[PDB]
Design a protein around this nucleic acid. Structure first.
Lengths: 379, 86, 162, 165, 85, 68, 80, 74, 79, 82
RNA sequence: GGAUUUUUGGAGCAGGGAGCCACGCAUCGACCUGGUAUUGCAGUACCUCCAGGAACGGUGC
């Protein structure tokens, strides 16, 4: 096998994919814009387009129609980028043959399926135009990733966690809204004004589950951003700063041992002590998870607010209102991502009498004259 | 009187303990006379029920999915988390 | 006629004659092995006979796959990470394919459970010392080309290639 | 549809024998089932059942005397129809051992058809020789062998061979 | 039914409740409960008073339980005696 | 007071997994609503025990050795 | 019972069954009785040691079933 | 005998010395005072034989039905 | 079709010596001649024996009523 | 007579229950039903050979109960009246 | 409304010792080397026999 051909086909496929996700970014600029905006608040350096472009949903001169579909295409582009990364990887890793090419000369076959099957394998849009999804990701379904209450990233469902929370506090004095008020705590509040004692079991377990949820939700709602990049960023921030990152002019330096320290000196000589060794060796995973909950909730401030709002709304609804709203959320959830008298007369005449034809759909006929007319019919 | 003691927890995420000592966590959607249970998005745990075990929370976890458990083999249930909205 | 979940979903599924769950992928003119994820790891073995596959590669992690019948295809190369996606691969039938060099059979050394191997009707078969080479490089094989790997052959393959 | 194999090394355990048999014979078509017992009576034998009949004929001709676990296997068409075939499916001379018909020309000849018919121990009558070289009269000692030859070239791309029904 | 509680094998329990006498209950848990029968039923569920629970772990052990309810399936044997005396 | 749906398995050879890690094989000759079975030409997994009664209580699983 | 109706709904689908002894049977559910007696076909069985086998036809008594896994195709009886 | 059933057999054995084996391998010898519909059993002057050896002399005893393996007259 | 209860009724009439497999106990089985039985499969056995499969030892019992709880399986023996 | 009826009266009592599997349960009864299925709140449950876990709520299948240890204060003679 | 498929139980109990490595007893099964018998058209608890090997597997105490 001549490697030249393989590497060629690779560069060609990469080109094909770039072209596909570029066509996408073209039809609906939001796809990129959306993504980029979020990226902006994670990696501050990122340069973002002119606001006007974003609003008018245009890339150069033409303003495109505003578009579940955005998210869909974002996950599709996600798998595309996965393919691309794979190919890039493998890639990083004459007369003799022309003679054997003479093999099996006599085949009556038309061969127009190398670039067409690929170009096609990665393009928009069924028979003609029913499903935006490419053949590449034809079995891609968002509803298996997002619940109905999340509305493809619009809201995050925290009712469940309100339940678990009630189970954690061993009472009922806590309302959904007071619970959200609790969540708001999450750079210093969640640490110095904790809902519960941060060494409580139930509490730490809960916090773990919740943290995990928020993170998965985050990356779920923003497929286009490099997950590994974000993860590593946060981890390095955790290791390099979260080193007495919390400082008070009065109490000094706080340690996630839950104690302060006069000066940095005693703080450092405390990070080798048996106490801190014990704690950092037992409560490491929890501390880290807490931190993640913190930063991921920060990155999702807009979604948190959006949901809290939703809660208050639904709460202030009536019965009919709440019902119709639910109807709406439901429809949004299960909708295609791309839209396209003679009484004795009938006895006398013999009609309205129950009868059945077996060969036709086990069909029912109400009259004998009619069924006798079935014998000559189209169906 | 009320019959509610099971119906209350319906739709909630529930931690169920089996007679061999397994832990089934799923969404409690239905029960009956025998306490045969219907558990949506159900996983099985063996080693632990985590209360934030600093080493790890999850070992021998298995994704099962939609589970019908026979009541014969059920021991007990506690509330694990609130209902998923979906 | 790309391999597809749609293709896989309408494919004959049955319990074979040796009591294993088998998927029938035969005679579709498949050129590249892909999208196996959709089988959901529910088959003991897959029958890929009479197709146009060039390389035994592209498999997802499939823990239950134990038998691969790959008769009358165009296999000329074997992928390198096969044990990482097929840990319990026990039987591999490659009759009537295109493996030409002894070195192309090297990737089979990494399949720790591989016990039944058939490479008949491949050019590689006529290479000097083909049998001893396979025995020394893939010692986990117990039956090669429907003949028992015997001790004397193992020793003989230990001399040559030691 | 079913081939009868004998002269097999009876030291192989039953489940291993059946699995190698399945593997070996999969190259010609889907094998529906394999019947092999180790009783005194049945040891060293096996019945291999294929979905397609052309597959059985191809298997028979191509693997005649194939070394399997040390011995050369002997293959033949089974005497009766397999129970599985009869269930999946649902004249007095049939199966007959004399196949006369034509539609097999193209420089074809008597030593050609005589060697193809020869393949079979049933090789008894072979009539293919006039300017024709396209009318084949084959009298095969028995229908297992006539059926073997006929099943071997049962679609000589389409020749017409008609048993003396 | 009362007749069957009164004269049948359960009369052992019926007699213990009436006379406020002690009985030893050999139990499935490999433990033995020694006390007075305040109430009982078909299944041999019981409400017991002044229960001395005894078992072994070899080491013998015991513990006092003033008031308790026993689900009757755990019953192996119920013994009446000159125990109360 | 339902019957087990076993008419399909009548007069077929079967493989019976019983509690105690016990296994027997034989031909189904009949049954009742408790799933008590009559098994003929029964064999303890091998020694021949003839026609026997298996109490449905102790029946874990059965597997047909035939096609139904 | 409500769960029983949902079980009958899974007839004709591929299901997984664990017994009281922990053997795991996966295949097509042909018939499910009221008492949980289960007729299945084209089974894969995974024993407690990990080994697999293949069976054409099986029938398991309801009492000696620990649990069943049903498709997620059913999840969509929300009234109760 | 012409059909001798469980119930009458046990009733004939009331007033008699019996020994009951339990599933758990304990054995209890005494005079059978009575049995009931569920086959719960009442012994007097009971003795306990464990490993077939006299262990304890117990007096009047109720045995729950589910424990019983078999009963023997003796 | 033979019904299981009837088989027993046959065992009874025949006075065939019977060997019973017990529930969750493999090392011991019980033997005897069924004289009568009831709706719960409780059996009255005559000249009954405990059979120790491990020790090859037999314990002589005489008149036995075995609760049906223990019955796994019922077989006939020539002895 | 039917002693489950007696247990059904013990809502809002705190008890210790020993299970068949050896587990020990201490909590406040919210409800006992006819199958002796028992429901509790503010529960400290100690599986045999663990340190306790606290649960806001726990629901026990009735059959899995060995026995209830009742409050010493409990006025049994009152509760046994129907 | 305690008698075989659920809620009045068939449960209960038994493992460390020796210097990371190795392990008592009983039953059953393939199983592995040699050699040797059979050439038989079937729908199957298993399937020749003879000698040697088991740092093999399962179950119970």
């Amino acid at each position: 096998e001549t490697i030249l051909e393989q590497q060629r086909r690779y560069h060609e496929e990469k080109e094909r994919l770039m072209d596909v996700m570029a066509k996408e970014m073209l039809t609906k600029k939001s796809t990129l814009r959306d993504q980029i905006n979020s990226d902006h608040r994670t990696r501050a350096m990122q340069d973002r387009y002119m606001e006007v472009s974003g609003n008018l949903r245009d890339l150069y001169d033409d303003k495109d129609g505003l578009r579940a579909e955005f998210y869909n295409r974002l996950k599709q582009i996600k798998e595309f980028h996965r393919k691309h990364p794979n190919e890039i990887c493998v890639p990083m890793s004459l007369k003799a043959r022309e003679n054997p090419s003479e093999e099996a000369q006599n085949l009556v076959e038309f061969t127009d399926e190398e670039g067409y099957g690929r170009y096609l394998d990665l393009h928009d849009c069924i028979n003609l135009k029913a499903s935006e999804k490419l053949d590449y990701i034809t079995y891609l379904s968002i509803f298996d990733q997002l619940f109905d209450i999340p509305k493809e990233r619009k809201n995050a469902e925290y009712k469940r966690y309100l339940e678990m929370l009630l189970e954690y506090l061993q009472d009922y004095t806590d309302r959904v809204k007071p619970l959200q008020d609790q969540n708001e705590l999450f750079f210093e509040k969640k640490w110095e004004n904790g809902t519960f004692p941060g060494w409580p079991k139930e509490t730490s377990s809960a916090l773990t589950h919740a943290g995990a949820h928020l993170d998965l939700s985050a990356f779920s709602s923003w497929e286009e951003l490099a997950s590994l990049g974000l993860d590593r960023l946060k981890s390095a921030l955790l290791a390099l700063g979260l080193g007495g990152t919390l400082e008070e002019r009065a109490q000094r330096l706080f340690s996630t041992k839950s104690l302060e320290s006069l000066d940095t000196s005693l703080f450092a000589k405390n990070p080798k002590s048996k106490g801190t060794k014990r704690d950092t060796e037992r409560n490491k995973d929890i501390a880290f998870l807490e931190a993640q909950i913190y930063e991921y909730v920060e990155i999702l401030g807009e979604q948190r607010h959006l949901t809290h709002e939703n809660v208050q709304r639904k709460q202030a609804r009536t019965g009919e209102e709440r019902e119709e709203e639910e109807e709406e959320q439901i429809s949004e959830s299960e909708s295609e991502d791309e839209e396209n008298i003679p009484y004795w007369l009938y006895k006398l005449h013999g009609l309205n009498i129950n009868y059945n034809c077996e060969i036709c759909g086990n069909y029912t006929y109400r009259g004998p004259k009619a069924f006798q007319r079935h014998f000559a019919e189209w169906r | 009187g009320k019959s509610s003691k099971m119906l209350q927890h319906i739709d909630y995420r529930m931690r169920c303990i089996l007679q061999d000592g397994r832990i089934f966590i799923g969404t409690f959607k239905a029960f009956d006379k025998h306490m045969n249970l219907i558990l949506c998005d159900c996983d099985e745990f063996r080693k632990i029920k985590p209360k934030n075990s600093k080493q790890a929370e999850r070992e021998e976890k298995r994704v099962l999915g939609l589970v019908l458990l026979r009541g014969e083999n059920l021991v007990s249930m506690t509330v694990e988390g609130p209902p998923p909205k979906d | 006629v790309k391999l597809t979940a749609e293709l896989i979903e309408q494919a004959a599924q049955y319990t074979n004659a040796v009591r294993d769950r088998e998927l029938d992928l035969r005679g579709y003119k498949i050129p590249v092995i892909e999208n196996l994820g959709a089988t959901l790891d529910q088959f003991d073995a897959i029958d890929f006979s009479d197709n146009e596959i060039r390389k035994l590669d592209g498999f997802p992690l499939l823990r239950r796959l134990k038998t691969l019948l790959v008769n009358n295809n165009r296999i000329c190369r074997i992928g390198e990470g096969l044990d990482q996606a097929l840990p319990c691969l026990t039987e591999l039938i490659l009759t009537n394919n295109s493996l030409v060099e002894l070195g192309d059979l090297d990737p089979l050394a990494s399949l720790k459970s591989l016990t039944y191997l058939s490479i008949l009707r491949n050019p590689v078969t006529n290479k000097k010392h083909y049998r001893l080479y396979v025995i020394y490089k893939v010692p986990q094989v117990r039956v090669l080309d429907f003949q028992k790997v015997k001790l004397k052959e193992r020793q003989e393959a230990e001399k040559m290639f030691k | 549809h079913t081939i009868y194999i004998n002269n097999m090394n009876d030291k192989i355990k039953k489940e291993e024998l059946k699995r190698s048999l399945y593997a070996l014979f999969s190259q010609f078509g889907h094998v529906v089932d394999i019947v092999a017992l180790k009783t005194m009576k049945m040891r060293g034998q096996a019945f291999v059942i294929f979905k397609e009949l052309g597959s059985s004929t191809n298997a028979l001709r191509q693997l005649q005397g194939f070394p399997f676990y040390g011995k050369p296997m002997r293959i033949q068409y089974a005497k009766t129809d397999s129970d599985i075939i009869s269930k999946m499916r649902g004249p007095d001379y049939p199966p007959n051992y004399i196949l006369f018909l034509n539609n097999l020309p193209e420089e074809t000849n008597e030593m050609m058809l005589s060697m193809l018919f020869n393949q079979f121990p049933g090789f008894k009558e072979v009539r293919l020789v006039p300017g024709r070289h396209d009318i084949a009269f084959v009298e095969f000692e028995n229908d297992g062998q006539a059926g073997a030859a006929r099943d071997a070239l049962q679609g000589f791309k389409a020749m017409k061979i008609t048993y003396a029904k | 039914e009362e007749e069957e509680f009164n004269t049948g094998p359960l009369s052992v329990l019926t007699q213990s409740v009436k006379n406020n006498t002690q009985v030893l209950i050999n139990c499935r848990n490999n433990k033995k409960l020694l006390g007075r029968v305040k109430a009982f039923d078909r299944h041999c569920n019981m409400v017991l008073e002044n229960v001395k629970e005894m078992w072994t772990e070899p080491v013998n052990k015991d513990r006092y339980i003033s008031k308790m309810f026993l689900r009757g399936d755990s019953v192996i044997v119920v013994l009446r005696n000159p125990l109360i005396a | 007071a339902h019957p087990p749906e076993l008419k399909k398995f009548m007069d077929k050879k079967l493989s019976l997994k019983l509690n105690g890690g016990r296994h027997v094989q034989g031909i189904l000759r009949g049954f009742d609503p408790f799933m008590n079975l009559v098994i003929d030409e029964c064999v303890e997994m091998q020694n021949n025990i003839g026609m026997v009664v298996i109490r449905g209580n102790s029946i874990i699983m059965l597997e047909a050795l035939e096609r139904v | 019972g409500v769960p029983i109706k949902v079980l009958h709904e899974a007839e004709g689908h591929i299901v997984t069954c664990e017994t009281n002894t922990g053997e795991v049977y996966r295949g097509k559910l042909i018939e499910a009785e009221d008492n949980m007696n289960c007729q299945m076909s084209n089974i894969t069985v995974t024993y407690r040691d990990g080994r697999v086998a293949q069976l054409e036809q099986v029938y398991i008594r309801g009492s000696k079933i620990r649990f069943l896994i049903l498709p997620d195709m059913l999840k969509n009886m929300l009234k109760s | 005998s012409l059909p001798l059933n469980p119930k009458p057999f046990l009733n004939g054995l009331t007033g008699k010395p019996v020994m009951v084996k339990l599933k758990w391998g304990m054995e209890y010898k005494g005079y059978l005072v009575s049995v009931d519909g569920y086959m719960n059993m009442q012994l007097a002057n009971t003795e306990e034989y464990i490993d077939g050896a006299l262990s304890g002399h117990l007096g009047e005893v109720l045995i729950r039905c589910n424990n019983v393996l078999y009963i023997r007259g003796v | 079709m033979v019904q299981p209860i009837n088989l027993i009724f046959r065992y009874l009439q025949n006075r065939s010596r019977i060997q019973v497999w017990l529930y969750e106990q493999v090392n011991m089985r019980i033997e005897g001649c069924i004289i009568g039985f009831d709706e719960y499969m409780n059996l009255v056995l005559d000249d009954a024996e405990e059979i120790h499969s491990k020790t090859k030892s037999r314990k002589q019992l005489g008149r036995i009523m075995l609760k049906g709880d223990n019955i796994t399986l019922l077989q006939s023996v020539s002895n | 007579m039917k002693l489950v009826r007696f247990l059904m009266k013990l809502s809002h009592e705190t008890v210790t229950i020993e299970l068949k599997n050896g587990t020990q349960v201490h909590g406040t009864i919210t409800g006992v039903d006819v199958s002796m299925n028992t429901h509790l709140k503010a529960v400290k449950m100690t599986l045999k050979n663990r340190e306790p876990v606290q649960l806001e709520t726990l629901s026990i299948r009735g059959n899995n109960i060995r026995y209830f240890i009742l409050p010493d204060s409990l006025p049994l003679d009152t509760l046994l009246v129907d």
